[PDB]
Amino acid sequence: PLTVPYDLPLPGGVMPRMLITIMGTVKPNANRIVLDFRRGNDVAFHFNPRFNENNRRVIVCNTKQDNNWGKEERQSAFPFESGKPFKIQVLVEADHFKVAVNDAHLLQYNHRMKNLREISQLGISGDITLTSANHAMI
Ligand SMILES: O=C(O)CO[C@@H]1[C@@H](n2cc(-c3cc(F)c(F)c(F)c3)nn2)[C@@H](O)[C@@H](CO)O[C@@H]1Sc1ccc(Cl)c(Cl)c1
Ligand SMILES: [Mg+2]
């Protein structure tokens, strides 16, 4: 039963075989959800479900370095729904993150910021209630 914006510490830094699991519920009338894997002031991986982009829903992913966003990657498979619970898993692999939502594979995002051990925190914000957020080594 946790506070949003929530900062999940990642005290090792990230590395391959780290699995982050987030459980929550999308608020009625949600506009946005964000997961930010932060490296200092940079964002190595931003995962941003958007509920109204010109009346469509789309997940936007990107990397922010020195205050500049890179090329956006989009996924229009959109498994989130206003008022419904969800489970997000982010798996860290050597070359990419894999994201799964409700046990369905959703997208892969290749690492652009490859100093993974400097990613020290995951911010979780937007229009959700959060039940739990944890990382585990597998
Ligand atoms: O200013 C804009 O309205 C929000 O800015 C977003 C930028 N953003 C959104 C948020 C954000 C913050 C929150 F508190 C939330 F709860 C949330 F769900 C999202 N933080 N940063 C990235 O999504 C970025 C991805 O490329 O997209 C834009 S910035 C941007 C604008 C144009 C281009 Cl093409 C690019 Cl590459 C980036
Ligand atoms: Mg599927």
Does 30 contact ligand 1 (Cβ within 6 A)? no
Distance 40 CA to ligand 2 centre (A): 34
Instruction: Assign 109 to helix, strand or coil.
Output: strand
- Experimental method of this PDB entry: X-ray
Q: Using CA atoms, how far apart are residues 10 and 120, in angstroms rounded to an integer?
A: 5
What domain range is 51 assigned to? 6-137
- How many domains is the chain partitioned into structurally? 1
Q: Using CA atoms, how far apart are residues 91 and 81, in angstroms rounded to an integer?
A: 22
DSSP class of residue 84?
-
- Enumerate residues 6+ apart whose C-beta is below 8 A from 73: 60, 61, 62, 107, 109
Does 88 contact ligand 1 (Cβ within 6 A)? no
Cα 9 from chain centre: 14
In a domain, 30, yes or no: yes
Does 131 contact ligand 1 (Cβ within 6 A)? no
Does 32 contact ligand 1 (Cβ within 6 A)? yes
Q: Using CA atoms, how far apart are residues 125 and 128, in angstroms rounded to an integer?
A: 7
* CATH code, domain with 58: 2.60.120.200
Q: How many C-beta atoms lie closer than 10 Å to residue 69's C-beta?
A: 12
In a domain, 39, yes or no: yes
In a domain, 131, yes or no: yes
Distance 138 CA to ligand 1 centre (A): 31
Instruction: Assign 77 to helix, strand or coil.
Output: coil
In a domain, 82, yes or no: yes
Ligand-binding annotation for 118, yes or no, is no
Ligand-binding annotation for 17, yes or no, is no
Query: Quick one: which ligand is closest to 100's CA?
Result: 2
Sign (positive or negative) of CA dihedral 76, 138, 7, 133: positive
Does 49 contact ligand 1 (Cβ within 6 A)? no
Instruction: Assign 114 to helix, strand or coil.
Output: coil
CB-count burial class (<10 Å; 0-12, 13-18, 19+) for 33 = buried
Which string of DSSP letters, residue by residue, matches 16-65? TTEEEEEEEEEPTT--BEEEEEEETTEEEEEEEEEEEETTEEEEEEEEEE
In a domain, 84, yes or no: yes
Name the nearest CA neighbour of 30 among 61, 4, 6, 63: 4
To which residue do tokens 């075989």 refer?
A: 17
In a domain, 1, yes or no: no
Header resolution in angstroms = 2.0
- Enumerate residues 6+ apart whose C-beta is below 8 A from 54: none
